[PDB]
């Protein structure tokens, strides 16, 4: 989320997230969210 050169849509960067503990509060406070349309899961209960 703190990158500087997010690649263009024609060649979208892909990263793998594994072997860690996820707390999306950093994801919340590191962006003035404009659209958070989650489909397969409710954003509220995301930490369990």
């Amino acid at each position: 989320f703190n990158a500087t050169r997010f690649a263009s849509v024609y060649a979208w960067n892909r990263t793998r997230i594994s072997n860690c503990v996820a707390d999306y509060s950093v994801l919340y406070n590191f962006a003035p969210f404009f659209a958070f349309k989650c489909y397969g899961v409710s954003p509220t209960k995301l930490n369990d």
């Binding site: 397969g40 899961v41 409710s42 509220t44 209960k45 369990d48």
Partner: protein
């Protein structure tokens, strides 16, 4: 699944917002009840 996102109620209750969860819940109910009705009808015929 009968056309829902998943066949486990505990899974589909913690992966969707309550206002939308009812849509996926109200498919398992109907599938299960049609299965039950089919069972009871064949049982009545066998009993006869």
């Amino acid at each position: 699944k009968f056309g829902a996102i998943s066949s486990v109620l505990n899974d589909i209750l913690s992966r969707l917002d309550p206002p939308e969860a009812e849509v996926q819940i109200d498919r398992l109910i109907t599938g299960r009840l049609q299965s039950l009705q089919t069972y009871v009808t064949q049982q009545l015929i066998r009993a006869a």
